[PDB]
Amino acid sequence: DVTTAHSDYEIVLEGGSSSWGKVKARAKVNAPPASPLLPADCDVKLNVKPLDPAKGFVRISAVFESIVDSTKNKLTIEADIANETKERRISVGEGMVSVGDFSHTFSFEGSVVNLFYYRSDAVRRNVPNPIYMQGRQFHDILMKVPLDNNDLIDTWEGTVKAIGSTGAFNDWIRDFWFIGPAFTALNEGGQRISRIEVNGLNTESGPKGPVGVSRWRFSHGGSGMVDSISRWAELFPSDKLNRPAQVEAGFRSDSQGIEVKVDGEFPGVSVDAGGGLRRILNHPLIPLVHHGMVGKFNNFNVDAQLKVVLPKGYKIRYAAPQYRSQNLEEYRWSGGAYARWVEHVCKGGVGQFEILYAQ
Amino acid sequence: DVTTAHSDYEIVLEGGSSSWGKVKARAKVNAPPASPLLPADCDVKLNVKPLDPAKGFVRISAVFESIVDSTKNKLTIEADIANETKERRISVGEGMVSVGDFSHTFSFEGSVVNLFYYRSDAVRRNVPNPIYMQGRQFHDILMKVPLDNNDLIDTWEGTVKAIGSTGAFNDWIRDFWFIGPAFTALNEGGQRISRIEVNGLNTESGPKGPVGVSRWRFSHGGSGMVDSISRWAELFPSDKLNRPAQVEAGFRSDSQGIEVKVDGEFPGVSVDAGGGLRRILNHPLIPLVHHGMVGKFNNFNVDAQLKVVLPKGYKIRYAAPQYRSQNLEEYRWSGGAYARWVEHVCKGGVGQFEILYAQ
Amino acid sequence: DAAKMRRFLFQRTETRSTKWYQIFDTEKLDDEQVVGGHLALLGVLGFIMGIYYISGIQVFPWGAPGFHDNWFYLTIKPRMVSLGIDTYSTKTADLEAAGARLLGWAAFHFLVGSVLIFGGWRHWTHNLTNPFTGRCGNFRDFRFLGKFGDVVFNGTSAKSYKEALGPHAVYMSLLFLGWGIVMWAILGFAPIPDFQTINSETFMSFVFAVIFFALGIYWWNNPPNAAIHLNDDMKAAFSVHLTAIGYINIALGCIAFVAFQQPSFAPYYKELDKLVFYLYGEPFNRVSFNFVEQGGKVISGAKEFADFPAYAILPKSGEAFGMARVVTNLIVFNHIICGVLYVFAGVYHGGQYLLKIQLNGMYNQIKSIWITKGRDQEVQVKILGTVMALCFATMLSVYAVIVWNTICELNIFGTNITMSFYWLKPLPIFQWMFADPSINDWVMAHVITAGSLFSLIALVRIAFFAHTSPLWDDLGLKKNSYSFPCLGPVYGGTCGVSIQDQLWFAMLWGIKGLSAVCWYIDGAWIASMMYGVPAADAKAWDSIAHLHHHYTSGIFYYFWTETVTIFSSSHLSTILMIGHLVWFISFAVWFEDRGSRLEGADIQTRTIRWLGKKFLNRDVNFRFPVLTISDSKLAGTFLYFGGTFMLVFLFLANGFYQTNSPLPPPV
Ligand code: BCL
Ligand code: BCL
Ligand code: BCL
Ligand code: BCL
Numbered sequence A, B: 001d002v003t004t005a006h007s008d009y010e011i012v013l014e015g016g017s018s019s020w021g022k023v024k025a026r027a028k029v030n031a032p033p034a035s036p037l038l039p040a041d042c043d044v045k046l047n048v049k050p051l052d053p054a055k056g057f058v059r060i061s062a063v064f065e066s067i068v069d070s071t072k073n074k075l076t077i078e079a080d081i082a083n084e085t086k087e088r089r090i091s092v093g094e095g096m097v098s099v100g101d102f103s104h105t106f107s108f109e110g111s112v113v114n115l116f117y118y119r120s121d122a123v124r125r126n127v128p129n130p131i132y133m134q135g136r137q138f139h140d141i142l143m144k145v146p147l148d149n150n151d152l153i154d155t156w157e158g159t160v161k162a163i164g165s166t167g168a169f170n171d172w173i174r175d176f177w178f179i180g181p182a183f184t185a186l187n188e189g190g191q192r193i194s195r196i197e198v199n200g201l202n203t204e205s206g207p208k209g210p211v212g213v214s215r216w217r218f219s220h221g222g223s224g225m226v227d228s229i230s231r232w233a234e235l236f237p238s239d240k241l242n243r244p245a246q247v248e249a250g251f252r253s254d255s256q257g258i259e260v261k262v263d264g265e266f267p268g269v270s271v272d273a274g275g276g277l278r279r280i281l282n283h284p285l286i287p288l289v290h291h292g293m294v295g296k297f298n299n300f301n302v303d304a305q306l307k308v309v310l311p312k313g314y315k316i317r318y319a320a321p322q323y324r325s326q327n328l329e330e331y332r333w334s335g336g337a338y339a340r341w342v343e344h345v346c347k348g349g350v351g352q353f354e355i356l357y358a359q
Numbered sequence C: 001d002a003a004k005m006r007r008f009l010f011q012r013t014e015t016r017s018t019k020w021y022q023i024f025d026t027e028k029l030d031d032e033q034v035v036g037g038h039l040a041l042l043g044v045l046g047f048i049m050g051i052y053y054i055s056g057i058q059v060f061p062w063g064a065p066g067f068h069d070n071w072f073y074l075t076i077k078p079r080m081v082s083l084g085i086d087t088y089s090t091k092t093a094d095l096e097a098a099g100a101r102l103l104g105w106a107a108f109h110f111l112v113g114s115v116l117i118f119g120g121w122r123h124w125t126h127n128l129t130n131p132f133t134g135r136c137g138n139f140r141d142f143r144f145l146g147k148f149g150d151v152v153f154n155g156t157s158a159k160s161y162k163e164a165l166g167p168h169a170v171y172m173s174l175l176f177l178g179w180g181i182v183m184w185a186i187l188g189f190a191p192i193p194d195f196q197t198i199n200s201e202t203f204m205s206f207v208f209a210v211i212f213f214a215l216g217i218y219w220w221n222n223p224p225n226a227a228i229h230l231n232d233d234m235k236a237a238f239s240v241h242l243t244a245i246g247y248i249n250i251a252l253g254c255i256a257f258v259a260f261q262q263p264s265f266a267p268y269y270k271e272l273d274k275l276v277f278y279l280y281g282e283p284f285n286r287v288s289f290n291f292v293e294q295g296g297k298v299i300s301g302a303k304e305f306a307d308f309p310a311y312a313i314l315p316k317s318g319e320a321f322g323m324a325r326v327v328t329n330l331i332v333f334n335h336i337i338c339g340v341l342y343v344f345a346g347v348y349h350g351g352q353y354l355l356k357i358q359l360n361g362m363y364n365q366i367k368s369i370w371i372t373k374g375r376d377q378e379v380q381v382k383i384l385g386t387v388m389a390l391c392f393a394t395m396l397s398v399y400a401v402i403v404w405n406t407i408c409e410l411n412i413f414g415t416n417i418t419m420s421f422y423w424l425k426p427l428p429i430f431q432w433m434f435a436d437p438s439i440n441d442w443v444m445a446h447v448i449t450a451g452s453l454f455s456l457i458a459l460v461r462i463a464f465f466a467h468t469s470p471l472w473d474d475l476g477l478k479k480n481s482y483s484f485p486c487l488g489p490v491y492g493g494t495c496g497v498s499i500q501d502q503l504w505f506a507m508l509w510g511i512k513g514l515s516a517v518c519w520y521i522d523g524a525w526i527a528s529m530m531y532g533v534p535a536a537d538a539k540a541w542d543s544i545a546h547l548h549h550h551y552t553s554g555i556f557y558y559f560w561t562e563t564v565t566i567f568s569s570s571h572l573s574t575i576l577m578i579g580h581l582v583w584f585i586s587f588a589v590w591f592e593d594r595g596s597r598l599e600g601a602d603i604q605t606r607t608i609r610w611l612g613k614k615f616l617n618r619d620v621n622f623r624f625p626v627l628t629i630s631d632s633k634l635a636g637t638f639l640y641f642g643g644t645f646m647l648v649f650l651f652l653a654n655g656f657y658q659t660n661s662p663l664p665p666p667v
């Protein structure tokens, strides 16, 4: 008993020092989703616009439009993230959270600090392409949610009362923050969530209405698997943002199956590999380790095509798994080794697939 | 050359306000059990009899007759559980534990407290069927085991000595309480076991012989996945116990496979779904998440038939996956989508299968 | 008495209820009962096939006279001749030997049919117990003939329809191989691979048994995931099979027309032109008013012919009556009308399932490109929009040609046949499709094209508007049901909007292309409504266009000529009266007069009560019933469609009267 899933991929890269690449991905799967509520649909939109080159600041937006078991759910975020130093990164942004007839807005002033347990020269010299880097992240959070609704006030009153009466609030809040299967994902990616620390929970008046204010700070450590820690500099190509970059995706899910559409350009798709050779960015490990969690429930047959388009004059030096066919500057992957590697990484495997293209 | 498993299911429901349903389940599987000792066989019996309607008290019995690697093992429980309040539930009961030529009896005075981290009206309002509810449970335990055997005395002396000499007894007792793979089950269902607290370990004389007495209290938190916490009111239909209810099951296991038989009536099989529509109770999540732990070791083919029998005048308004056939009052599920959902939930999936039947 | 009276009309309503013609529906039967029912009918089919064999005997084994000719066996006689069971021989010895063979095949089909009916009762009642070994079997998991099942199916049975494909294909190769052995061992036809002999049907009976077995193993290991939603519901799969079988039947009808009159098929179909047939119901030897034949015989009376006894069916020359093509037209049309009917029902029973899902909301949950690419309302009105446009630009282009040709031939508005489309004929690329290509061939291709796109409109509407349409989404209405007559007078009225009614408008609209086939295969002229009448230029066609053959009649003059032979037969004419009687009665239930009959029935039942009480002492309450509109449109389409083609049989069975001598101009 085996079901079938069909998918198509596409990466178009520019020449020179440009790290800009266009990525398109279509997928269609015939097994039920692990979600205990169906049907669940979802559309996501990300847009990043450079504000100023010298400062390095950029404006990032995010819209989530998901209907879960006929319940409209929307989350909106608008933020200004910039590079302060090699380990610190401050973000100022506003957003809105709406579920059915309920909605509440929030404003945040936050900074994230990222440190590597060690920084040795020998590791850099002897390992040309390191994957695992051991580290920890620290978030400073100043949330500003106006208590407009009757329910908001009650959630705040209850929260303050709980803190006041329960000593174990810093610990047991991690059981709430990661609801249902989210708690299990933490151990799965080798990620440790430390106890939150409440600097202050003070109600401050605002022109509209009373504004519950929270000033908290937390930390979390990655054994190396986590990409936010292991790759802190790579997930924010702010300085390479010469023009605006957008990633647009969406998916439909129900008892019958899942339909997914993804498209968008952004920098960082191509990174230097040494000896004048360029290379597609190492696959994020967290998404694969997180999908092996739901991808191991139905035996499936893989039908995936990966069309990679390179710049004029730019030819692969090496790829494993090797491209099935080639069309001048365009190279194709389908079948054989590649549709084994897809079966590998769709079930949680993180095996390396490397493409080196030199001019 | 190819593994296969066969199964039969059956639910018969009454009309009116009755939540009474008859459930029969037969299964036969051809892969070896994960148990590192075989053959292991086991018969379980549960009977609940209402004592008085006004008090809400009920008498529950449990018998376990299991032979493990030719070692007869029996556990017997007789208890009186009643509803004190919305979050507290006191139980008074006695039981016996026999392994081979060893046996010891126990008496317990216990209460369980269940609190939800939050209780918001908007959730209730915006959600028609809530699956995940975040919570914690607290057990007050007063165990009374008479030290009749030479071994009991030694287990008690040793326990007291261990507490006296080891500071980390509250922590390292969780390594003993959950033996082999039951500890890994804790993280799997998003369930946290807090450290036990020993109120007292005092030997009190009894007419028969010295009686080691333990007064302990512990807690455990559910991210929402745990059904004891998320569904505290539903797992005890005491007030709906107009007549006695019994669940009888048993299973045989060895190198060749598992044979399982389950049958019994009890209330709570049918719950109101809104708009005058009734619905089969949401599948327990803990059993599925716990079976995905042993069900992912052998590729298998599913042969499952689910015969559902409804009351006179009662037809289904909606089901996904849809019933293969209908035959008058009864509706049948087999094959196609349903035998995909069975392969989904037998490997640990928790995907929703909903039946709505209105008069 | 109002209440009691209303309990009755309520007993005959337009709402959902159980009807006698829906008791064997897919919904109320499991997969073991479909297999059991198919087996019990094939057992009945074998019993039927064994009667078409006994009827074919001309002289019995003991040498006495047997049965007269009948149309049932005639359509199978060229096949039994092809297989050697039947032989075209003047010698009475060959006729007596042949009869023994048919009787033997009839008894054999009686035995095998009795087994399939028995094997169709136990499967139906799930009482599938081996009477020899006390142990019963399992439907879900069985060995499938023991050792054979283990080697090919790994000893396991399919648990789902997509899995049953491999085993079903393997079962087919056991029939392809089974027939290839019967032909070789019992019928003596060795597999010689040359395609002008019956021996080629044994060679390809083994090639096909190899293709299917290999194909049946590939689908056992790799079952197709296409149209997965079908595996969930029986009627979804049963309807796609019926949409597929109909195109298969139309294909069988179209190849049996090209093949049955090929030179290689001459020994079996053309060969019939040299036989004298005593068909039943044909004019017999008449006798005088005062005709009494006593023991002495032929005394005090007179009879017609005198070369045959009183009341004896007279001979009929096969060449004059065109027997060969009559049989070829009876088989080709049968598998074409049925094919068309099967396609319409596949779409109907399919949209009957599309309604069930839209109501339950499973419609948005399907992932198959077969439903997903069809749930957009904008895409629907584009598909239907092009179908309607194509149907219009082709029904008006070909009808105006036929009308213009009719006007030119009758010299209306001072126009001669010279101004008609006698120069228009199929292009040279297509000329191979036709014998003596002409305008009669250009028109027929475009009429079928227009006749398909016309009835396709009613089919695209069943597929797309089963629950809602762009108009009813506009009018804010739901099509709760597949057999609801109308919503009432509202919005200028909305009658005939359900998919069952759209099925009726596909069957009714399909009578035109279903008649362009009857007319075209009988050598009738289709380019003009009037060809061959004793009028201005009707008889000038054969020489204006230089046709090698001479068509029997034109669309209108077809009824006059073809019926000269129908009126001569006392049985073909009884069909003309019965078939017409059945057809008009459809107007009584198809016309919008359902309410009138009801108030009339009230006067009927009131008058009967009145007459019974005034004359007798008893009380006569019968409460005269009246059919419902949806129950009317049902019986209306059966009387219309069923009387329309009760008479199309007379056109095909009256003889094939196309000739090979084109007429000179009537100058
Ligand atoms: C998921 C792994 C980490 C994580 C990873 C990071 C990273 C990485 C950083 C932040 C930083 C921040 N984090 Mg954090 N953060 C986590 C958990 C949290 C939680 C929480 C609910 O527990 C909170 C309140 C915060 C809060 C914050 C903000 C103060 C700050 C900016 C967020 C923002 O603008 O998002 C915007 C809102 C969104 C919905 C964006 C979601 C984006 C997803 C995750 C990835 C999309 C990119 C896609 C793969 C490629 C797109 C290219 C296009 C050009 C965009 N973090 C977990 C533990 N956090 C940032 C910082 O340094 O501030 C100084 C930052 O760089
Ligand atoms: C399994 C998930 C939870 C759990 C869930 C609950 C629930 C739920 C409640 C109890 C409550 C109690 N728990 Mg506790 N409890 C757990 C761990 C423990 C441990 C331990 C060894 O660590 C101990 C000593 C206890 C002790 C106790 C008792 C003081 C008390 C009554 C138990 C009883 O009578 O069982 C009877 C003995 C048995 C063997 C029964 C086993 C039943 C199984 C688990 C389910 C059977 C029902 C079946 C699905 C449907 C049957 C319908 C028929 C009509 C019966 N709990 C874990 C952490 N506990 C109860 C209380 O509130 O008391 C006031 C109660 O309602
Ligand atoms: C005639 C024009 C349509 C047609 C229109 C209808 C209509 C209208 C109805 C059905 C219904 C049925 N159809 Mg249909 N159906 C046709 C062709 C077929 C064929 C085929 C021979 O290929 C089959 C196997 C079926 C199968 C079936 C069943 C799923 C169902 C109940 C049958 C029954 O009880 O009959 C009656 C049982 C008998 C013993 C009487 C004799 C029937 C003989 C054996 C022929 C069977 C097919 C015939 C059309 C059945 C209906 C006869 C009515 C007088 C219309 N249809 C064609 C395509 N079908 C019903 C249903 O529930 O649909 C959802 C229904 O209301
Ligand atoms: C099965 C139900 C009935 C039955 C009903 C019929 C019917 C109905 C007919 C005959 C006819 C015949 N039968 Mg009988 N017959 C039965 C049992 C038998 C048995 C036996 C082994 O018991 C034998 C030896 C015969 C013998 C014969 C011959 C005398 C004769 C010609 C058969 C033929 O051409 O087969 C060739 C057979 C095959 C190649 C087998 C496979 C057929 C395949 C599966 C389907 C073809 C159509 C397919 C859909 C085409 C498109 C391709 C698609 C993509 C799938 N019958 C039982 C009792 N019999 C025929 C006749 O008299 O003609 C005048 C005829 O039409």
Ligand code: BCL
Pocket (backbone or CB within 6 Å): C035, C039, C115, C116, C118, C119, C120, C122, C123, C127, C128, C129, C130, C131, C136, C137, C138, C139, C142, C143, C144, C145, C146, C157, C171, C174, C175, C178
């Ligand atoms: C033409 C014959 C009909 C048929 C008519 C019968 C008859 C007759 C009998 C059964 C009975 C049985 N049927 Mg049935 N049945 C058919 C199709 C099937 C199919 C299938 C989907 O292919 C299956 C799984 C079954 C299942 C079963 C068995 C489990 C059961 C066994 C008792 C017995 O005597 O068994 C012997 C059979 C088996 C142990 C099963 C394995 C062998 C095969 C499948 C048996 C059917 C005949 C075989 C296919 C014929 C030759 C086909 C060649 C291609 C020419 N049948 C075939 C097509 N069925 C029995 C019953 O109802 O008893 C009261 C019985 O005697």
Ligand code: BCL
Pocket (backbone or CB within 6 Å): C390, C391, C392, C393, C394, C395, C396, C397, C425, C426, C427, C428, C430, C441, C442, C443, C445, C446, C449
């Ligand atoms: C002068 C053009 C004539 C015509 C003359 C021919 C000829 C000649 C032949 C066919 C043949 C065919 N015709 Mg024609 N055909 C016309 C219009 C149509 C229409 C249509 C509704 O638009 C359809 C569906 C068909 C269908 C078909 C197929 C059965 C077959 C396909 C090959 C073909 O056309 O080759 C040749 C096609 C062309 C030379 C050009 C086709 C132009 C397209 C198809 C549309 C024409 C314009 C349109 C009709 C404008 C009318 C609008 C109205 C005023 C509203 N024809 C017009 C009226 N047709 C062949 C066959 O086998 O006949 C038996 C053949 O030999």
Ligand code: CLA
Pocket (backbone or CB within 6 Å): C581, C582, C584, C585, C587, C588, C589, C591, C593, C596, C597, C598, C599, C600, C601
């Ligand atoms: C032969 C065809 C025929 C027959 C017999 C009838 C008969 C009848 N019609 Mg109908 N009708 C017909 C065709 C026919 N109609 C058509 C084509 C239409 C469409 C325009 C209508 C539209 C229609 C409407 C709108 C109404 C009726 C009504 C009536 C009834 C009122 C007359 C009455 O009481 O006695 C009339 C006299 C007789 C019936 C004597 C019997 C005549 C023969 C012997 C009947 C038996 C022959 C029959 C054809 C056998 C069938 C054989 C089979 C092979 C087909 C009557 C039962 C009215 C009514 O009350 O409805 C119940 C009514 O409101 N007629």
Ligand SMILES: CCCCCCCCCCCCCCCC(=O)OC[C@@H](CO[C@H]1O[C@@H](CO)[C@H](O)[C@@H](O)[C@@H]1O)OC(=O)CCCCCCCCCCCCCCC
Pocket (backbone or CB within 6 Å): C250, C253, C254, C257, C258, C332, C336, C340, C433, C434, C435, C436, C437, C438, C441, C444, C445, C446, C448, C449, C451, C452, C453, C455, C456, C509, C510, C511, C513, C514, C517, C520, C521, C522, C523, C524
């Ligand atoms: C429900 C609505 C539909 C009803 C059902 C219609 C299905 C039938 C499907 C049409 C087939 C008819 C079948 C009988 C086969 C038969 O006749 O084949 C032979 C041959 C002539 O043979 C000789 O016939 C003599 C009789 O007079 C002559 O004198 C002589 O000169 C000539 O050589 O006919 C063609 O070539 C067939 C023409 C029609 C051409 C088909 C064009 C259709 C193709 C294009 C698209 C159509 C579909 C559009 C989408 C719906």
Ligand SMILES: CCCCCCCCCCCCCCCC(=O)OC[C@H](COP(=O)(O)OC[C@@H](O)CO)OC(=O)CCCCCCCCCCCCCCC
Pocket (backbone or CB within 6 Å): C582, C585, C588, C589, C597, C601, C604, C607, C608, C611, C624, C625, C626, C627, C628, C635, C636, C638, C639, C642
């Ligand atoms: C003193 C007062 C006088 C009134 C007393 C008596 C009044 C008249 C009542 C009897 C005369 C009516 C006789 C016919 C009158 C007549 O013609 O009525 C036409 C009739 C319409 O019926 P209604 O729904 O009007 O109901 C009439 C009843 O109320 C009877 O009065 O048409 C049909 O029933 C369709 C055929 C159904 C079957 C469809 C089968 C399709 C395939 C065909 C295969 C062969 C057909 C054979 C099938 C049977």
Ligand code: SF4
Pocket (backbone or CB within 6 Å): C485, C486, C487, C488, C489, C493, C494, C495, C496, C592, C593, C594, C629
């Ligand atoms: S006459 Fe019949 S179809 Fe017309 S509106 Fe009335 S009920 Fe509807």
Ligand SMILES: [Ca+2]
Pocket (backbone or CB within 6 Å): C522, C562, C651, C652, C654, C655, C656, C657
């Ligand atoms: Ca004729």
